[PDB]
Ligand binder design. Structure first.
Ligand SMILES: CN(C)c1nc2cc(Br)ccn2n1
Ligand SMILES: [Br-]
Ligand SMILES: [Mg+2]
Ligand SMILES: [Zn+2]
Length: 313
């Protein structure tokens, strides 16, 4: 009970900032996650023995793909940590517990392919779940791991608190389906501007937690330019692999995914910052003013992609 995790000074300070990079030392990522849980939640939220066993089973069930991997899991959990710490009083005990676990689990057993590719492939998971295919699988794997002997980090919740936290985690993971993001932000935009947004309305919290999840999931666009630039390589390596597999099914992939059309990437990143990222962190800043640094960092990187196009790097 008296066993804190402590990090080296540079990490101890930088981890509090939205733009923190968890680094290339895999073996430190579990301790980073626990540190965050302890400061975000308490030293008491989870039995350390069970948490550690839950973390290492979650790690095992992320695959060795270029981007949708264990590092992404922890990166996305860190962004949620930064949002929760800069918005101390807005979130219940259960939400703080549930959301860091949601973020760590959100891409469990991802194979590096989109919901579209599963459906064109006719992957079994596409028959089991017609929408938010991978996201329903990710929630399914989370529940599977939670039910391994020794792994129930929630065992000390009441029956009804347990049901609420698994419901927070399910909606949180489903919301990482970018197809659902557009409508979810449109509604939050209207609710904010007409003044009807009410954080005591459960259906409204759900929407706001969904946007937080989109923001954490996209947080690679809110890092320092060199982190953003190198992560984009990993993202495009999955896209081009998926484009290769589309060609194998006899389908010309969208250009984003065509490795013959790399030249078009900087313009494609422009489109994405403008269509998805900027609107996402704008609406999030409006709802949760202290998340402004994510918007500012996102704008800085949009500006960096504009420079790539103009031939200035
Ligand atoms: C090109 N689009 C779909 C895309 N998706 C992402 C997600 C993140 Br994080 C960063 C860049 N991109 N680029
Ligand atoms: Br990126
Ligand atoms: Mg995902
Ligand atoms: Zn993700």
């Amino acid at each position: 009970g008296l066993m804190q995790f402590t990090l080296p000074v540079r990490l101890c300070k930088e981890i509090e900032l939205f733009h923190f990079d968890i680094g290339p030392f895999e073996n430190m990522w579990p301790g980073i996650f626990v540190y965050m849980v302890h400061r975000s939640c308490g030293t008491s939220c989870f039995e350390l023995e069970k948490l550690c066993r839950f973390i290492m089973s979650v790690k095992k069930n992320y695959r060795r793909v270029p981007y949708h991997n264990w590092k992404h899991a922890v990166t996305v959990a860190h962004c949620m940590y930064a949002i929760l710490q800069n918005n101390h009083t807005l979130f219940t005990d259960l939400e703080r517990k549930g959301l860091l676990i949601a973020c760590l689990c959100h891409d469990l057993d991802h194979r590096g392919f989109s919901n579209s590719y599963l459906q064109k492939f006719d992957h079994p998971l596409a028959a089991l779940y017609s929408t938010s295919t991978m996201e329903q699988h990710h929630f399914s794997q989370t529940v599977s791991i939670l039910q391994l002997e020794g792994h129930n980090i929630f065992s000390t919740l009441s029956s009804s608190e347990y049901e609420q936290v698994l419901e927070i985690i399910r909606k949180a993971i489903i919301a990482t389906d970018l197809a659902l993001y557009f409508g979810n932000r449109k509604q939050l935009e209207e609710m904010y501007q007409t003044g009807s947004l009410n954080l005591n309305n459960q259906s409204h919290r759900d929407r706001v937690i969904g946007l937080m999840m989109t923001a954490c999931d996209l947080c690679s666009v809110t890092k320092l330019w060199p982190v953003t630039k190198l992560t984009a390589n990993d993202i495009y390596a999955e896209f081009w692999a998926e484009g290769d597999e589309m060609k194998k099914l006899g389908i010309q992939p969208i250009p984003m995914m065509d490795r013959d059309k790399k030249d078009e990437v900087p313009q494609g990143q422009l489109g994405f910052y403008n269509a998805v990222a900027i609107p996402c962190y704008t609406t999030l800043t409006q709802i949760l003013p202290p998340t402004e640094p994510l918007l500012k960092a996102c704008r800085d990187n949009l500006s960096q992609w504009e420079k790539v196009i103009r031939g200035e790097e």
